[model samples]
Target: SAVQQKLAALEKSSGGRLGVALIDTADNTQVLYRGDERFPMCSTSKVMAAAAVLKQSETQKQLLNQPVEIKPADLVNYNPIAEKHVNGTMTLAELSAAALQYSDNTAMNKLIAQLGGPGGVTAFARAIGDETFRLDRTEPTLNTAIPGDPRDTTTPRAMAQTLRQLTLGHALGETQRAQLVTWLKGNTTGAASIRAGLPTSWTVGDKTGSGDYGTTNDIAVIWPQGRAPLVLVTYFTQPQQNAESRRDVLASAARIIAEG
Candidate 1:
């Protein structure tokens, strides 16, 4: 009840819909605020694409060594890794890291294309028992974040659930899942958000996303030094009436749950 009260305060003060899910996978204890509300997923889905790729490669070794081409059209803004390898080819593993660690726009698109586009990632989520996560469009367009349009969107709990499966649920082979964990831990964008709120002693692996309608989000897997891993997701979106995007909101939310 206290968590809900505090979260409600955050929603009222932040002037947006703030959805959060903190799940301690060890015992399945959770605190959920707007956990079922839909928010545009934005770049958060890229992590899933990377996961699908990891699962794919685990059985088909060629995927790990196979090179996928990067053409000029695949490039998009904020693509530090894709731009670096533009017009060149990169292995699936490289693309996976680029998409997760750097949030490379092009790399994600390419990875999804390999997975048979948006529906492929959706099916992957389904395979893991998460029906709420979906991708209907590619990047740039998927980031629209329109109010209630429901394309390329998922609930906060859904994202956390999927992340838990891939990270702590053995959805992928053991080594592959750890690879995903390592890549998320190296994520470049969560610095001022979830990563900042968590204690340095705890291990954090996360993916960050930003979109319209005040959408700013982070999906994380945090390992407290002395306890089981926790899966936490904070997805904030402003409705048409009162819209604001603040990175600090994410950190503040994480601090609330991590303190427990």
Candidate 2:
């Protein structure tokens, strides 16, 4: 109820298609706003990729330390770390850390390649019970494109569910999930979105996505002192609009959820 009112107000002022889902992991309580609608996930899809790797590690004996070569041509623009470290080799774990913590497209592409491209990622999401999300294309294609690409997309509620699984140890084993959570907490991107609105006393393990055509998104597991953690997902698709304003919408949503 409170979530609807607050996010309704946000949608009216935010000038975009806004979707949000807040879940109190303590008791499985949830608050949703336009949660069924789909939006491009951008780099947020990296979480699924990483989870697939961890799961594969268990089933296929995938080695995180397995070395992979990075060609300079495979390197994409926008991420300084990936760009700087081109033409070298690194372990799978290292690539995953770069993709998850910094949202590096190059490292992400490498991981997706390991999983057998976008179709493989979609299979992972399906296996994890995310029906609406799809990973159809790579970063190079979606990089500067408008919304509705249909390449990489997810709903707010689906993302919340995915995070719930990851946080509750359903997605990966305890050790692997712990590693994922640690990587999420170390995310260096999206400083202006959901994490920006949280209280100083709270900590968040989260991922963020940004793109052309006013795409701004974030999913997080928020930890408030003396309380169980909660999951929050926010997405916005506003064509040719101010990206900062879209991010503020997410920040505002996070603040309201925290207040409750």
TM-score of each model, paired residue for residue = 0.96, 0.94
| Candidate 1 steric clashes | 0
Query: Looking at model 1, which ten-residue stretch has the lowest summed lDDT?
Result: 238-247
Residue 15 lDDT (model 1): 79
Question: In candidate 2, what are the lDDT values of residues 207-256, reduced to their tens digit?
Answer: 98887767788999888999988999998878674454378888988888
For candidate 1, give the lDDT of residue 217: 91
Residue pairs with backbone atoms closer than 3 Å in model 1 (clashes) = none
Superposed by TM-score, candidate 2 places the C-alpha of residue 12 at a distance from the truth, in angstroms, of: 1.2
lDDT of 1 at 117: 87
The CA lDDT of each predicted structure is: 0.86, 0.83
